[PDB]
Every structure is written in structure tokens, then in C-alpha cells.
Amino acid sequence: YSYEAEKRSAVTLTNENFKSRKNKTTALSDQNHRFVPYFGSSEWLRFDALHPAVLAEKYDRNYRPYFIGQRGSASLNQYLGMQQMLPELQNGTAVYVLSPQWFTKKGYNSAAFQQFFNNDQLSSFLSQNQTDANSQYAAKRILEMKPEITMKSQLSKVAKGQDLNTVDKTYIQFMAELNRREDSLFSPLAASNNANYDKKVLPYLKELPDQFSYDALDQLAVRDAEAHTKSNDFGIDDRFYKERLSKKIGKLKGFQKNLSYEVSQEYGDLQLVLNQFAKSNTNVIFVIPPVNSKWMAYTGLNQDMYDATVSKIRYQLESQGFTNIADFSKDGDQPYFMQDTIHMGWKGWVAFDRVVNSFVSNPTPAPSYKLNDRFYSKDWSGYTGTPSQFK
Secondary structure: OOHHHHHHHOOOOOOOHHHHHHHHHHHHHHOOOEEEEEEOOOHHOOOOOOOOOHHHOOOOOOOOOEEEEEOOOHHHHHHHHHOHHHHHHHHOEEEEOOHHHHHOOOOHHHHHHOOOOOOHHHHHHHHOOOOOOOHHHHHHHHHHHOOOOOOOOHHHHOOOOOOOOOHHHHHHHHHHHHHHHHHHHHHHOOOOOOOOHHHHHHHHHOOOOOOOOOOHHHHHHHHHHHHHHOOOOOOHHHHHHHHOOOHHHHHHHHOOOHHHHHHOOOOOOOHHHHHHHHOOOEEEEEEEEOOHHHHHHHOOHHHHHHHHHHHHHHHHOOOOOOOEEOOOOOOOOOOEOOOOOOEEHHHHHHHHHHHHHHHHOOOOOOOOOOOOHHHHHHHHOOOOEEEEOOO
16 A cells, blocks of 8 residues: 555554544555554653664564554543454454553543544444443443443443344444445545654664664663753653643642552453454553652552552453563663653663564464453452452
């Protein structure tokens, strides 16, 4: 199609590009250039010389990352976006960052939900009619997020477990067909490429060593990280620090004293993605990032709560077959692991590379998964004892 068109779609990172079926399926099915999907939220915007985009370009790897996510795109929105690219996951390989900031009790806004959801994702969703627990929970959550919804009756039938009437099926495949065609019509202008690749990827190639060396990458990361953090003591990027933290830094101290990520509906939402990976036989590495621990000190973010959160996430993942886990939750104290407060960069990007690039450069079949419906449950949403003792 167009390698440079796909290259710039792969790092555009706009909401409209997230829900563009044409863009992502195009890049993810190109048979002459391999794009691998990287699911996460705002973490992908932290361009610097060690960002995965830059690395896979410089050393010309047997793939390029296609990024899928933006602030607020947690697992429910991710699952529904996945509904638009089902072939591209089949027997595929994928990176999926589990951001722990996701797992709050009330979750995100309905407004943040709308900016990734659309009716193509919903018609796709209803078109695959399986009245299983996963369908039911999906429908339940959608009606929770957007209660004044089109095709509400069908969503209520799916959410109660009931089978869809001949008339329902026909309606939903017709709306499917139209939404697909609307995507194909509007993605050219509605979902156009950024300057992100030209302005925040390619420049950085000047800085990387012609010959690959993790030691050289680490040195470059520390030099550049030092250049871009002389405005504070948290080792937080200058621009992020003046733009989001400078003004209210006093009012901030202590503000996370009691905040937890241990109870969340996002646990069930995650289950939706795991079901999707299994049904599509996808081989995934799940990335867990830590938080600048100096920051966690200043805000009171309790690291043992973080550790229990990570543990429960990992339990859900491993107990089912998903064992590829680049878990960096305890690496937040390493100088320049993070680029901001809760987003890794620089050295963190190199650590990210060390596990992920081996995973993605060397695709292997996906193991056998055993899914466990008890993870959609309210009890698992609230459970806080030892993860092993759930049953």
C-alpha cells in the first residue's frame, strides 16, 4: 500500500486514528512490511531517542510498532477497538501495557469512554453473537458507560444472556455493513497522519549509534535524560514539569496517601482483552510499568499497594496462560527509568527494549490458555486477599 503512509500512521496517536478500522487493519495486514500492535495509553507519546519507534527504524528490525492507545484508553475501549481488527490478531503477536493508574475504583469518565468507542466497534461486537459470560459482561459495561445508546434493546438482550432474534441479527449486520463503509469513507480525512513520525521519530536517528550496543544506548539515555531534567529534583522532563506540575506542586504533596489500585472494574475489563487474545490465539507480552519512586514519596503513593495491585494483575494473567510479562513495577528508583511521573522513558525505554524486542523480533506460537469466567465477577473486582486463594 504505502510503507511511509503506514509508518506515519503507526505513531500518529490520535483518538480518531484509534477507532479508524481502515488505518490499523491496513498497517496490520501489509504482507511486505510487518507491523506489530502495541496497545497502551499515553505512554507512547513520550518520544525520545530510545522510544521503540525510533529503535525499530534505526536498526531496521523485522517489524515496526504500530501504536494503539491514548490517555484514557483502558481495556474496555481496547477490547472494543480490537473488535475492528479481529483478523489482524489471529495467531499474531502483540504488546499490551497494563497501566496501573487504570485500576481505580470509579475508573474513567464517560467522556473518555466516548472518545475511543464508536458504532463500528459496537456493531462488530454484536455481530459476533456468542451468549457467553464475556459477551454478557461486555454489554453490561457498555450500558454502564453509555446508557443512552443506539441498539439498546440488543445490548440488553446480550447483557442478560439471551439469544438475538432473527430480526436483531439482520439489523445488526446491516448497521455493521454501513459502519464499515463509513469508516472506509471518512478515515482518509477524519483519520489523517500526524507530523509525529517526521518531527518526533526521524530526527532522533541522528543520535543513535550506527552499530547496536545496549551500553551505548544506555549512555545516550543518561546524557539526554540529564539534558532534559535540570528544572527539578524528581528527574521529570522539563516540559512536563512546567506544564503539569510546577504551578500546583505544593498542593500536590501527600495527595495519594490513601489512593489504591486494588479495587477496580478494570480487572473485568482486562478479562475482556484476555478472552479476545485467547479466542484469537494471540501471543502477547504484558508490560507493567512502575512509578517514579521519588514522586511516589512526595505524593504518598504507597509502593506496597502498587505491589499488591501488580500481584493481582499477574495472578489473573499467569493463572490463565498469559505468562509473557515484562514486569518493571519495582524499577521506579533507577535513575532515569521514567521520563515523567508515571511514564517510562530514556533508560526505561532501553529496559523496555531488552525484553520486548526479543519477544517481538522472534515470534512464537501462543501457548494454550485456560480462561476463567470468575474474573468478570464483582467479587474479583473487589477481592483483596491473597490472589492464590480466590476459587
